[PDB]
């Protein structure tokens, strides 16, 4: 599409998210979600092919259903208290409908099914935007009304999301489905700490976004969407594979990497509330994510796979487009554990 | 050497874990991509959430 | 400790005026040195990804990375220290205003406390 | 303590800015100098400790392990020089970087006044070893080995972390000094039982315990020579150090909770010693012998008496040195024959006599011949166990007999008899290999002159 | 809470369930969404008119407008999907699988 | 004398649509290299 | 079967190189004779001459900070006093009973 | 200002540069025919830019210095061995065919980039289209397997589905016996060993599969040996006909912007020439791959990016 049109659509997506995050009226939050949905579809359908159209249709259906449920919860809450301000829910039925709608918007289990489908359908840039920027608004709304949420339902969905992400990522050879299931598991980790500390939710979101940005930019640079395609990257650009391996180590939560910071803190926070069993199950389940990250690391940099003859031609050329923020993203997603107490900045 | 170290101590912790995780992964990931089944599951979990947490 | 609703909090203010009552971080703070080191690593990785001599390709670029990291790290350290100071201030004020919830326990010495002895055998 | 940490960090820029043909010389020289510097932490006190700062402290349990860790890096460089000769400069520098990072993590792990800092570095050591095994290993099983070596560890280490943060929510601190001074008895409860298990199993899996020891033969057989050296010499001792540190808050529950682990260790030492008798692989045999020795160390720590702790310290140091030497000898054979099967290359005493002498000395010290520090630790642990129960002497004596049996079996199979006829590529041993063996063995026989340096804080 | 509100909410639940069965005809999915918004409009209008909250007389209009815009987008998507297969059957979108 | 590296038969383990092929998922085919299907 | 029975284009596995062939007096460190000799020299000087000898001498003469001689002198003077004054050598109570307040049972 | 979205936004549009003379032309013909001379005459008379036929070292001519690299570092195949031993055990035939197709793709991208950036037309020999005819012959003579042609078809589909075909396809029709006479009169010992069956298969798969397929989306000018000598009538025929049947009349500014971003970024042009499908004739082992890549990196001006190579003579490195 026209670059001016693309810029306008991206700025409309961002303006919808900002309208969600700056408003105090439920109607304006709903309008921000609507604007974001409206401007998101062409971005997903930018590279026109039937797969992207199918993904855009699935995304539109799920997000429109979530918006309808959100409006239903808003109207019930208005019925039981003539309030439009985002604060308390004022009704058990309105809070359940609201949590369901926001979980469907985020992709939390049991509403996770659309995430791998849409992420596989769309390109790598659309998947980057979808898995990073589209979580800011529902999570901000959840952070605002967290004192209303029933901890049982939120914790159930968080544990389900962690389990589903772990088990579903084990079976994947496509990189985009791996990213989708990783996103699902990280959403589960984020929403399990909302009832206790929203600061830890925001910290986990920041760390996850940094790691996901680095991972997607590395995947775009070495333009591979398949495990075997990524196995060829060492014969052209081994440093990219090494950075990818260290980033995958960070994504698995292995200390002393950056990805260890959220889970640790989250576990720490949950122990202050006499919650012991659930963090233990969460860590043991995140071991599965680490396992399939290790499988990818084996396939990418730790061993050298067979190549093809035509690769020699690729040795003679350099990337025309380079990413300005990729080195900063790699360093931030790898080496910020010593700076952990800075989380008091209420990020 | 063979009975305990190579077989049973191997069967208990690592092999059982691998088998369980493999079966769970094969169950969870195997969805035919039919959104009919997805939204039927959505309805079932919606009604369960309404009837279980309040 | 949710301080989001703490009274007299200007909405989008990074560093309030009262934060000026606190000692600023020293320029040789180890955390500032680590932020500069992070900027240096970013410069090295930038050189490596673009297939340039890693250590000696662009000195201006590496200097800019180090300087920007140090700048942001200084302001971040100030905000971090201010938030911890607020936490301690609030905690001490709450303990002072609620004496019945934080009683002064009696001083007992070990010569008058009976602890069970468990032999190691 | 920074006077040791900073030079280790400076080892990295010095490595990466070295010439293509000067990396080994510079790394070896400066690693030896760092070892000499670290040797001045042996001046310990009969009082509390050498509390350098709020972050790092030294102990007479920590100092011998630190000295051994520093001394191991030059030997690892010498051992790795040979099989990495045909390697590119960047990848050799990356290998040396992995070794330096592992040393730095170990040095900070052993001082580490905090239990969370100890946990973080204790798990940070897991990454360079994994890379070394899965990258510069020869066989196709290395990847599998790495997987095992990873997940086993994490299977024990995630519960510990939970327990750790839980403790700080109740005690308010995880500093070793405050933890020791403010220790209170642990009640006989289900919650306390599971807290005890969470505190213990992480260090128990790394010794390794007899039931959980499967990762070790895989990792050692699959790893390169430097990886095997550091796994057998230092990484196995992290569990012993952690157990000795953490069992202070587990009393009196250790009396009841120790029984299953004591039985597992006392029977599995017999089991693994007997396994060594029927082993067709040198590296696998040496790994199983290591499992037996660490079973004895586990018994010592669980008994939890002064003589137990002294014997455990002495045995950990002695086993580290001896097992590293044994792996180096087996690797010298492998670099000639490329087989790693014990029965293949035979009668090597006739072809390599000085290396046969090195084999004899290593077998004698693995056999715990007095007055070696191996036997000092063995005897102290055995006496403590006898006081614990007089029936343990049966299992200890059986273990000693079987240990002598497989040590001399390994010596006789490889060095005695008739040479294999069709093997004609056996070259005279190099000055590098002879010096490597000497630098392993002379420190042991020097340490037997001053045993109190390796007998720990209860001396 | 009167019976009229419960009747409207049960209509909303029926429309949502219909959107959830997916017999076929993504066209029917769009119909179910439109029935859901019709019930939303009716019940919000009743609540706002009952309590004489004069300013929220705005929001049904707003809701209406936005929902219809959504419908337009949805219809467009439908056409393109049909433009690939010649029919709007739900089971045709089985190319991407979990 | 030479460190082992993956060959074709090892790399072909990772070329399927999913890991762990089963009877129900045996018929599944990997997506096209460019994410474009024939219009038929 | 038109296949070459070859799975891929691969380098043949080379034969291991002997350092003693191109250079007798090879010391087993490096294929460059000068670098080889100097690597031998630095290993021997810094490992045997410096660390192994000077470090052993340093450890041998470490000052008595564990206070063994001090403890023996304290014990000697304490025994000398107690023998002369008729006191019963070591006491069974480690702490003075008069500064311990026991809890009354009265059962 | 390297071309991108910003240049398109500010002023850069490629429709204003087209002056009805762009009209990319591609000449064909048999192995030994005067297609190169006719193409060069067309390029000189129309004022267009001539692209000599892509060889083993065409990519070498556009990267670094134009000097060709070693055969083991560039192509790993030879036409002389294909002539001497067409049924070689090392799979030289299909390796040669695939490398040549990749070179054709690179040259077509270069020609499209030149036309879209300057507006001047280009003239080409055998393009990515009609490259398959050799492949077809190699299949019928038994030189390559069916898996080879299947892999070729996959790569050709996924690569050539992204470009605009040439407006004008020029074919020089020369019969097999006179081509063979030209071959013996040439003097090349390796060229001598071509059979008549190979040339017949080339021509047959040539005028029995390539002419109708380009007839429905391009405009084809068939010429014989005698009437290809005079370029004046060929130029007149090219000028007289107007192209309004292909995809070219449907292009506009944003489609041209998409194509111009495509034809740059030669890595993204060559993306699907190395798809992970393992044919023994083209797959290379890890050890050989590592050794050959390390040897390539040690070339004089190849260790770093083009402007950051001190040994070639690049200065001011520490300030770039
Ligand atoms: C605990 C904290 C303390 C320690 C901190 C550690 C981290 C610090 C650094 C962080 C990252 C920054 C640098 C990384 C950029 C990579 C560049 C590179 O490739 O190296 C080539 C470059 C030289 O080669 P070149 O000719 O320019 O170009 C070659 C190409 O780059 C490429 O060469 P090639 O193509 O010929 O070879 C390909 C190779 C190339 O691939 C790589 O080189 C990998 C690069 C490392 C990945 C970086 C990830 C991000 C950071 C992760 C840190 C993890 C730490 C946590 C613990 C986990 C451990 C993994 O890839 C492979 O071979 C694949 C197989 C690799 C095996 C598996 C991968 C494992 C990698 C893990 C490494 C972790 C430590 C790295 C240390 C730095 C290494 C240079 O090396 C350098 O010189 C850079 C080193 C730093 C320079 C220091 C200068 C200062 C000296 C003077 C000042 C003195 C200081 C005191 C002042 C006062 C004195 C008076
Ligand atoms: C007994 C007192 C002797 C005092 C004289 C000073 C001796 C200093 C030795 C220092 C340690 C040895 C260094 C290890 C490497 C071996 C050197 C070498 O490369 O040989 C080439 C060299 C040149 O000959 P070549 O023809 O060119 O080489 C051809 C092949 O190598 C073929 O060579 P080969 O066929 O001739 O065999 C090589 C030889 C050398 O290979 C070895 O096996 C030597 C290592 C044996 C120890 C095995 C580990 C057990 C742990 C015991 C710890 C003792 C260390 C004490 C402190 C050490 C200070 C660093 O092996 C043997 O002869 C078998 C000896 C079995 C000894 C078992 C008895 C152990 C307990 C003895 C009492 C110790 C404490 C007494 C306390 C109560 C009384 C005060 O040959 C020698 O110099 C042989 C060394 C002399 C034999 C050592 C046996 C007695 C020394 C025990 C340690 C020091 C005792 C201190 C108490 C003084 C009163
Ligand atoms: C994940 C690693 C860090 C990446 C973070 C991005 C780095 C680039 C950002 C550049 C600076 C951004 C600061 C913006 C300038 C002024 C911001 C100010 O106006 O807003 C304040 C807010 O300041 C920011 O929130 C603090 C940002 C600092 C984030 C860094 C902490 C990361 C944790 C430590 C990991 C180590 C990272 C260090 C290396 C980068 C007041 O917000 P307030 O209206 O009152 O409350 C709303 C938010 N609530 C609800 C959560 C309370
Ligand atoms: C596999 C390789 C090695 C791995 C490591 C193995 C070591 C782990 C072994 C765990 C140590 C023992 C666990 C609990 C010990 C407490 C004693 C108790 O079990 O015995 C009786 C307890 O009675 C019964 O045993 C109750 C428990 C029965 C249920 C346990 C399952 C039994 C077999 C399962 C073994 C599987 C272990 C591995 C799990 C993955 C005592 O009677 P009682 O006076 O009433 O209880 C006193 C304790 N109180 C006061 C806290 C209540
Ligand atoms: C080939 C045959 C040999 C030919 C030569 C013939 C001569 C042989 C004589 C040598 C062996 C015979 C044994 C006689 C021992 C004499 C020396 C001994 O008495 O000194 C010991 C001293 O030895 C040292 O204490 C032990 C050596 C130190 C070990 C450190 C290892 C070196 C560092 C390298 C790193 C290794 C890492 C290991 C991890 C821990 C004990 O001294 P001590 O009675 O107490 O008091 C010393 C004097 N004071 C009173 C003033 C304090
Ligand atoms: C609650 C859930 C807890 C989940 C805990 C997960 C523990 C981590 C292990 C995860 C492994 C699961 C996946 C798996 O094993 O796949 C089978 C896989 C097949 O190999 P692939 O490369 O994937 O492809 C084969 C076909 N080409 O089998 C293997 O290779 C396994 C090899 C390494 C085994 C690792 C053993 C780890 C378990 C040791 C004990 C501790 C487990 C953790 C919990 C312990 C309980 C306290
Ligand atoms: C997974 C779920 C594990 C269930 C174990 C439950 C243990 C538990 O909850 O104890 C909590 C206990 C305190 O009890 P409270 O709930 O705070 O209050 C009680 C008094 N009102 O806190 C703790 O000690 C937490 C420590 C972690 C628990 C252990 C979890 C794992 C099991 C123990 C480790 C043994 C397995 C190790 C595997 C080794 C494989 C190599
Ligand atoms: N796709 C191809 N496959 C095999 N050989 C080719 C291919 N393309 C060109 N060649 C060879 O390149 C040589 C020169 O091409 P040709 O047109 O026959 O001669 P000329 O340059 O005189 O026109 C010929 O020997 C031809 O066989």
From Swiss-Prot, chain A:
Function: Core subunit of the mitochondrial membrane respiratory chain NADH dehydrogenase (Complex I) which catalyzes electron transfer from NADH through the respiratory chain, using ubiquinone as an electron acceptor. Essential for the catalytic activity and assembly of complex I.
Family: Belongs to the complex I subunit 2 family.
Membrane topology: Multi-pass membrane protein
Subcellular location: Mitochondrion inner membrane
Annotated transmembrane regions: 3-23, 25-45, 59-79, 89-109, 149-169, 178-198, 200-220, 237-257, 274-294, 325-345
PANTHER family: NADH-UBIQUINONE OXIDOREDUCTASE CHAIN 2
UniProt organism field: Sus scrofa (Pig)
Known catalytic reactions: a ubiquinone + NADH + 5 H(+)(in) = a ubiquinol + NAD(+) + 4 H(+)(out)
A Pfam entry, by short name: Proton_antipo_M
Record text on subunit structure and interactions: Core subunit of respiratory chain NADH dehydrogenase (Complex I) which is composed of 45 different subunits. Interacts with TMEM242.
Protein name: NADH-ubiquinone oxidoreductase chain 2
UniProt entry tagged with the keyword ATP-binding: no
MF (Gene Ontology): NADH dehydrogenase (ubiquinone) activity
E.C. numbers: 7.1.1.2
Biological process, per Gene Ontology: mitochondrial electron transport, NADH to ubiquinone; mitochondrial respiratory chain complex I assembly; reactive oxygen species metabolic process
UniProt KW keywords: Electron transport, Membrane, Mitochondrion, Mitochondrion inner membrane, NAD, Respiratory chain, Translocase, Transmembrane, Transmembrane helix, Transport, Ubiquinone
Gene Ontology CC: mitochondrial inner membrane; respiratory chain complex I
UniProtKB/Swiss-Prot annotation, chain E:
Known partners and oligomeric status: Core subunit of respiratory chain NADH dehydrogenase (Complex I) which is composed of 45 different subunits.
Main localization, broad class: mitochondrion
Reaction catalyzed: a ubiquinone + NADH + 5 H(+)(in) = a ubiquinol + NAD(+) + 4 H(+)(out)
Record-annotated disulphide pairs: none
Subcellular location(s) of the protein: Mitochondrion inner membrane
Lineage: Eukaryota, Metazoa, Chordata, Craniata, Vertebrata
UniProt keyword Transcription, yes or no: no
Topological category with respect to the lipid bilayer: Multi-pass membrane protein
EC number(s) on file: 7.1.1.2
Entry's Gene Ontology BP terms: ATP synthesis coupled electron transport
Ranges that cross the membrane: 1-21, 29-49, 61-81
Keyword list, A-Z: Electron transport, Membrane, Mitochondrion, Mitochondrion inner membrane, NAD, Respiratory chain, Translocase, Transmembrane, Transmembrane helix, Transport, Ubiquinone
Gene: MT-ND4L
GO CC field: mitochondrial inner membrane; respiratory chain complex I
Family statement: Belongs to the complex I subunit 4L family.
Name the UniProt record assigns to this protein: NADH-ubiquinone oxidoreductase chain 4L
Function description: Core subunit of the mitochondrial membrane respiratory chain NADH dehydrogenase (Complex I) which catalyzes electron transfer from NADH through the respiratory chain, using ubiquinone as an electron acceptor. Part of the enzyme membrane arm which is embedded in the lipid bilayer and involved in proton translocation.
Gene Ontology MF: a single term: NADH dehydrogenase (ubiquinone) activity
UniProt source species: Sus scrofa (Pig)
Enzyme class: translocase
């Amino acid at each position: 599409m026209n670059p001016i049109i693309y810029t306008t659509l991206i700025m409309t997506v961002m303006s919808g998210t900002m309208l969600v995050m700056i408003s105090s009226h439920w109607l304006l939050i709903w309008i921000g979600f609507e604007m974001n949905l409206l401007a998101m579809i062409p971005v997903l359908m930018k590279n026109f092919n039937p797969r992207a159209t199918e993904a855009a249709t699935k995304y539109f259906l799920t997000q429109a259903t979530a918006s309808m449920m959100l409006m239903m919860a808003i109207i019930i809450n208005l019925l039981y208290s003539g309030q439009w301000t985002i604060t308390k829910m004022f009704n058990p039925v309105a809070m359940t409908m609201m949590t369901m709608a926001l979980a469907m918007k985020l992709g939390l289990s049991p509403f996770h099914f659309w995430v791998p489908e849409v992420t596989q359908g769309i390109s790598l840039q659309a998947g980057l935007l979808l898995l990073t920027w589209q979580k800011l608004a529902p999570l901000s709304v959840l952070c605002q009304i967290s004192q209303s949420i029933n901890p049982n339902l939120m914790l159930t969905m968080a544990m389900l999301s962690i389990l589903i992400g772990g088990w579903g990522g084990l079976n994947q050879t496509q990189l985009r489905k791996i990213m989708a299931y990783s996103s699902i598991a990280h959403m589960g980790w984020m929403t399990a700490v909302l009832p206790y500390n929203t600061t830890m939710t925001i910290l986990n979101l920041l760390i996850y976004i940094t790691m996901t940005l680095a991972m997607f930019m590395l995947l775009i640079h070495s333009s591979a969407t398949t495990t075997l395609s990524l196995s060829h990257t060492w014969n052209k650009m081994p440093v990219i594979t090494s950075l990818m391996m260290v980033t995958l180590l960070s994504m698995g939560g292995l200390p002393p990497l950056s990805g260890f910071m959220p889970k640790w803190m989250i576990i720490q926070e949950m122990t202050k509330n006499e919650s012991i069993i659930m963090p233990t199950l969460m860590a043991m389940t995140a071991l599965l994510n680490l396992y399939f990250y290790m499988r990818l690391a084996y396939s990418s940099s730790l061993t050298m796979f067979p190549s093809t003859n035509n690769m020699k031609m690729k040795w003679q050329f350099e990337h025309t487009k380079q990413m300005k923020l990729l080195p900063t993203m790699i360093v931030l997603s790898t080496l910020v554990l010593p700076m952990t107490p800075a989380l008091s900045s209420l990020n | 050497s063979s009975l305990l170290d190579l077989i049973w101590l191997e069967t208990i912790l690592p092999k059982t874990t691998s088998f369980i995780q493999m079966k769970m992964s094969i169950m969870v990931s195997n969805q035919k991509g039919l959104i009919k089944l997805y939204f039927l599951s959505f309805l079932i979990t919606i009604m369960i959430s309404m009837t279980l947490f309040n | 400790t949710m301080m989001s609703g703490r009274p007299g909090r200007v909405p989008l203010q990074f560093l309030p005026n009262e934060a000026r009552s606190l000692p600023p971080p020293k320029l040789t703070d180890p955390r500032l040195v680590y932020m500069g080191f992070l900027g240096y690593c970013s410069g090295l990785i930038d050189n490596a990804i673009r297939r340039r001599p890693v250590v000696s390709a662009g000195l201006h670029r590496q200097l800019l990375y180090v300087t920007s990291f140090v700048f942001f790290g200084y302001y971040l350290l100030k905000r971090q220290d201010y938030m911890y100071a607020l936490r301690d201030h609030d905690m001490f004020a709450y303990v002072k205003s609620h004496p019945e919830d934080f009683p002064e326990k009696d001083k007992k010495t070990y010569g008058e406390i009976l602890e069970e002895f468990h032999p190691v055998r | 303590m920074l006077k040791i940490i900073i030079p280790t960090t400076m080892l990295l820029p010095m490595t990466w800015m070295s010439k293509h043909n000067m990396i080994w010389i510079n790394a070896t020289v400066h690693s030896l100098l760092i070892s000499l510097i670290s040797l001045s932490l042996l001046n310990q006190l009969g009082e509390n400790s050498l509390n350098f700062s709020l972050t790092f402290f030294s102990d007479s349990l920590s100092a011998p392990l630190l000295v051994l860790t520093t001394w191991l890096l030059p030997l690892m460089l010498m051992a790795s020089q040979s099989h990495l000769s045909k390697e590119t400069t960047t990848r050799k520098k990356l290998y040396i970087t992995m070794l330096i990072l592992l040393q730095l993590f170990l040095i900070m792990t052993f001082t580490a006044t905090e239990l969370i800092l100890f946990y973080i570095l204790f798990e940070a050591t897991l990454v360079p070893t994994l890379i070394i095994i899965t990258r510069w290993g020869n066989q196709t099983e290395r990847l599998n080995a790495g997987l095992y070596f990873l997940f086993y560890t994490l299977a024990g280490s995630l519960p510990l972390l939970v327990a750790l943060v839980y403790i700080q929510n109740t005690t308010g601190s995880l500093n070793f000094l405050i933890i020791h001074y403010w220790s209170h008895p642990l009640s006989n409860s289900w919650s306390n039982i599971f807290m005890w298990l969470a505190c213990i199993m992480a260090f128990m899996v790394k010794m390794p315990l007899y039931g959980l020891h499967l990762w070790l033969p895989k990792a050692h057989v699959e790893a390169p020579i430097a990886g095997s050296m550091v796994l057998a010499a230092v990484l196995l001792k992290l569990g012993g150090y952690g157990m000795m540190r953490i069992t202070t808050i587990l009393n009196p529950l250790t009396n009841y909770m120790a029984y299953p682990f004591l039985m597992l260790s006392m029977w599995g030492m017999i089991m693994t010693s007997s396994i060594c008798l029927r082993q067709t692989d040198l590296k696998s045999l040496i790994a199983y012998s290591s499992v037996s020795h660490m079973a004895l160390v586990i018994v010592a720590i669980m008994i939890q008496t002064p003589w137990s702790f002294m014997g455990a310290t002495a045995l950990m140091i002695a086993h580290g040195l001896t097992s590293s030497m044994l792996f180096c000898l087996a690797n010298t054979n492998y670099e000639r024959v490329h087989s790693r099967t014990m029965i293949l290359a035979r009668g090597l005493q006739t072809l390599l006599p000085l290396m046969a002498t090195w084999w004899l000395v290593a077998s004698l010290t693995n056999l715990a011949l007095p007055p070696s520090i191996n036997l000092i630790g063995e005897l102290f642990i055995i006496t403590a166990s006898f006081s614990w129960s007089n029936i343990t002497i049966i299992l200890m004596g059986m273990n000693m007999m079987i240990t002598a049996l497989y040590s001399l079996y390994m010596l006789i199979t490889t060095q005695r008899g008739k040479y294999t006829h069709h093997i004609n590529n056996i070259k005279p041993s190099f000055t590098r290999e002879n010096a490597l063996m000497a630098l392993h063995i002379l420190p042991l026989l020097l340490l037997t002159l001053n045993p109190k340096m390796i007998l720990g804080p209860l001396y | 809470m009167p019976l009229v509100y419960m009747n409207i909410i049960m209509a909303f639940a029926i429309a949502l369930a219909g959107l959830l069965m997916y017999r076929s005809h993504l066209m029917s999915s769009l119909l179910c969404l439109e029935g859901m918004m019709l019930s939303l409009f009716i019940m919000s209008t009743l609540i706002i008119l009952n309590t004489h909250f004069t300013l929220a007389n705005m929001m049904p209009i707003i809701l209406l407008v936005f929902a219809a815009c959504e419908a337009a987008l949805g219809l467009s998507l439908l056409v393109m999907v049909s433009n690939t297969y010649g029919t709007d059957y739900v089971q045709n979108l089985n190319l991407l699988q979990c | 004398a030479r460190q082992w590296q993956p060959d074709v038969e090892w790399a072909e383990q990772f070329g399927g649509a999913v890991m762990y092929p089963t009877k129900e998922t045996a018929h599944w085919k990997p997506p096209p290299w460019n994410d474009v299907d024939p219009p038929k | 079967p038109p296949e070459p029975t070859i799975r891929l284009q691969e380098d043949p596995d080379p034969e291991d190189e002997n350092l003693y062939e191109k250079n007798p007096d090879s010391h087993g460190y490096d294929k460059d004779p000068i670098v080889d000799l100097w690597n031998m020299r630095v290993v021997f000087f810094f490992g045997f001459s410096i660390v192994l000898v000077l470090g052993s001498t340093f450890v041998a003469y470490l000052p008595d900070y564990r206070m063994q001689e001090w403890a023996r002198r304290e014990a000697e003077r304490l025994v000398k006093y107690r023998e002369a004054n008729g006191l019963p050598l070591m006491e069974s109570n480690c702490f003075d009973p008069n500064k311990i307040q026991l809890p009354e049972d009265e059962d | 200002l390297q071309y991108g979205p910003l240049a398109f936004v500010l002023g850069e549009r490629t429709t204003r540069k087209l002056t009805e003379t762009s009209k990319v032309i591609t000449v064909d013909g048999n192995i030994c025919s005067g297609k190169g001379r006719l193409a060069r005459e067309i390029a000189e008379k129309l004022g267009l830019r001539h692209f000599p036929e892509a060889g083993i070292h065409y990519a070498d001519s556009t990267t670094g210095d134009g000097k060709p690299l070693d055969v083991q570092l560039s192509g790993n195949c030879s036409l002389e061995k294909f002539y001497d031993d067409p049924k070689s055990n090392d799979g030289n035939s299909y390796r040669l065919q695939s490398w040549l197709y990749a070179s054709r793709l690179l040259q077509y991208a270069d020609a499209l980039e030149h036309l879209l950036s300057t507006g001047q037309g280009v003239v080409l020999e055998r393009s990515i289209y009609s490259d398959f005819v050799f492949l077809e012959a190699m299949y019928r003579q038994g030189f390559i397997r069916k898996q080879c042609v299947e892999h070729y078809n996959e790569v050709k589909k996924v690569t050539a589905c992204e470009y605009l075909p040439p407006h004008v396809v020029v074919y020089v029709d020369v019969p097999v016996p006179e081509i063979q006479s030209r071959i013996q009169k040439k003097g090349n010992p390796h060229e001598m060993k071509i059979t008549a069956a190979y040339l017949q298969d080339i021509e047959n798969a040539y005028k029995k599969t390539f002419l109708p397929e380009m007839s429905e989306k391009c405009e084809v000018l068939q010429y014989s040996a005698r009437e290809a000598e005079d370029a004046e009538k060929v130029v007149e025929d090219i000028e007289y006909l107007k192209c309004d049947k292909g995809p070219w009349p449907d292009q506009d500014d944003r489609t041209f912007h998409r194509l111009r971003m495509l034809v740059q970024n030669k890595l993204e042009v060559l993306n699907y020439t190395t798809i992970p499908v393992y044919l023994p004739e083209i797959t290379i082992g890890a050890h050989q791959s590592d050794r050959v890549f390390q040897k390539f990196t040690e070339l004089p001006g190849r260790k770093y990016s083009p402007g950051y190579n001190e040994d070639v003579g690049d200065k001011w490195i520490w300030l770039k």
